[PDB]
Amino acid sequence: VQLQESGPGLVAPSQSLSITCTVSGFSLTNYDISWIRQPPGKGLEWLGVIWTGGGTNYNSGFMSRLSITKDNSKSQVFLKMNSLQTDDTAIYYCVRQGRSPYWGQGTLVTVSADIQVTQSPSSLSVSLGDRVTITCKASKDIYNRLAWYQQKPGNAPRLLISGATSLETGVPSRFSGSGSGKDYTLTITSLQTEDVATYYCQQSWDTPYTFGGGTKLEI
Amino acid sequence: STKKTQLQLEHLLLDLQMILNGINNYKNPKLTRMLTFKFYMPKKATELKHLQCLEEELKPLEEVLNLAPRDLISNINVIVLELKGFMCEYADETATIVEFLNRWITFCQSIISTLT
């Protein structure tokens, strides 16, 4: 399974942004594809989704300048965004939106010059061996459609937990998710140095598939 | 009793077809919105204990039906609880409400066709 974003690099506001997501190892006839972006010093925000069967849903803040299309025969998804401004500078990711979301590498685009999810705390200064709890409270029931992500600077988010409680293979036993309806918790036991990172939750029950604001964990 | 078991499966099969036929053969101005929601799907569903995977999705199912149901879901809940007697394993692909209902209708027909 691979998703590979190909974008322009630098674009002027006179032009439209066009990014191609080329996928391998699965079919676009079997999965929804979301587009996410992350501004340079900021958290993650969901832009839109193209459904397995063809239609789309866009974030209300972008629905007038965004276009997501796809070609099932070529395993490619296309994002087009117009009326560009400097704050559209971001890393753009395409995401396979299965039960355990599978993310692309992300491509940086530089522009030339609703269920709310409350994540707490925003920052945690802590020590090795400590156990930390991060909470992700949704404004409505989300029926366990809650994923936890770990992000180190310079890298894409890594999926830790999906479906509120399912530990992804390859992620240490020290991580666990819990919760039921509106309130979800990530617990890290025996804090280790390789856990220093920013953590984000994302709900995927109803669009827009909103993220929590992030929790920066420093030792 | 393999007899009582199949009247419950026949009952569970009918309840699911009632929901499917109520969103398929019906005006439904909220169909496009209803279709956006994604249901978790069983990695395997061949034994009655796999109905655990259906039970856990009854709460999202009721929520989606409400956008257009408590009685039907509660009736289904009782039958599932009677029939199932484990740890549900989910596939990665998620499904629309129609694909979800079709999978569990198919499941009942498989099981009904193995005790008669």
Residue-range domains of chain B with CATH: 2-112 (1.20.1250.10)
Whether residue A97 contacts residue A112, with contact meaning beta carbons closer than 8 Å, is answered with no
Query: Residues 112 to 171 of A: which have CB under 8 A from any B CB?
Result: 141, 143, 145, 163, 166
B60: closest CA of chain A, how far (Å): 6
Same-domain pairing of A101 and A123: no
Question: Can you tell me the distance from the alpha carbon of A16 to that of A5, in angstroms, rounded to the nearest whole number?
Answer: 16
Whose CA is closest to A47, among A2, A5, A8?
Answer: A5
Question: Can you tell me the distance from the alpha carbon of A25 to that of A73, in angstroms, rounded to the nearest whole number?
Answer: 14
Could you tell me the resolution of this structure in angstroms?
1.7
CB pair distance less than 8 Å for A30 and B32: no
CB pair distance less than 8 Å for A99 and B37: no
B37: closest CA of chain A, how far (Å): 7
* CATH number of A188's domain: 2.60.40.10
**SS3 call for A33:** strand
**What is the number of alpha carbons within 13 Å of residue B72 lying toward its C-beta?**
15
| Residue A97 touches partner B, C-beta closer than 8 Å | yes
Whether residue B33 contacts residue B67, with contact meaning beta carbons closer than 8 Å, is answered with yes
Whether residue A69 contacts residue A50, with contact meaning beta carbons closer than 8 Å, is answered with yes
Same-domain pairing of A145 and A178: yes
Whether residue B45 contacts residue B56, with contact meaning beta carbons closer than 8 Å, is answered with no
Question: Can you tell me the distance from the alpha carbon of A68 to that of A59, in angstroms, rounded to the nearest whole number?
Answer: 12
Determine the length of chain B.
Answer: 116
- The partner residue sitting opposite B90, judged by closest CB among A31, A32, A163, is A163
- How many beta carbons lie within 10 A of that of residue A131, not counting itself? 11
Beta-bridge mates of residue A97: none
- The DSSP result for A156-170, as a single string, is PPEEEEETTTEEPTT
Beta-bridge mates of residue A76: A22, A71
Question: Can you tell me the distance from the alpha carbon of B77 to that of B83, in angstroms, rounded to the nearest whole number?
Answer: 10
The technique is X-ray
Same-domain pairing of A193 and A142: yes
Instruction: Mark which of A111, A137, A156 sits at the end of a domain.
Output: A111
- The DSSP result for chain B, as a single string, is -HHHHHHHHHHHHHHHHHHHHHHHSS--TTHHHHTT--B--BS---SGGGGHHHHTTHHHHHHHHTT--HHHHHHHHHHHHHHH-----B-SS-B-HHHHHHHHHHHHHHHHTTT-
